[PDB]
Amino acid sequence: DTFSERTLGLNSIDNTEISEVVSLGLVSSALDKITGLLSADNLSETVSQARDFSHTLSKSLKSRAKSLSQK
Amino acid sequence: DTFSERTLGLNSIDNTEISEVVSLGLVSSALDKITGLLSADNLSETVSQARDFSHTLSKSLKSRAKSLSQK
């Protein structure tokens, strides 16, 4: 796991056994952590971590979409 | 529609007729726009807009989760 994958709890999000509602709970949670980062300050490091979170989440949803479309 | 709802194309994302894969396409797209904002600069205004995007998306996925769980 990368830092973002582990921190955002995403290492199973592209498992198709996970229902849509549960998936939406994981995404919501990840987005709220991004919102939180962006609410504190606008330091470069903070902004860069939020960008890693966003990108990691996007990449995982593309992976999930792939797994889902397979079936 | 708010600025973020319209810009991120989210005004139907909590419609249950929209399939999961299509939903994931809308979320991915929204997250990529957040990544893009956070990749340019760390000005307060830029950071605040990205935070609006993130929050708006999260709120819409909670709404979608609600609509889905209803059925």
Curated annotation (Swiss-Prot), chains A, B:
It comes from the Eukaryota. It is found in: Cytoplasm; Nucleus; Chromosome, Telomere. Interacts with taf1 via the Myb domain, and ccq1. Regulates telomere length and function. Required for the repression of telomere-adjacent gene expression and for normal meiosis or sporulation. It may be a negative regulator of the telomere-replicating enzyme, telomerase, or may protect against activation of telomerase-independent pathways of telomere elongation. It may be involved in the interactions between chromosomes and spindle proteins, disruption of these interactions would lead to defective meiosis. This is Telomere length regulator taz1. It comes from Schizosaccharomyces pombe (strain 972 / ATCC 24843) (Fission yeast). The chain holds residues 408 to 478 of 663 of the full protein.
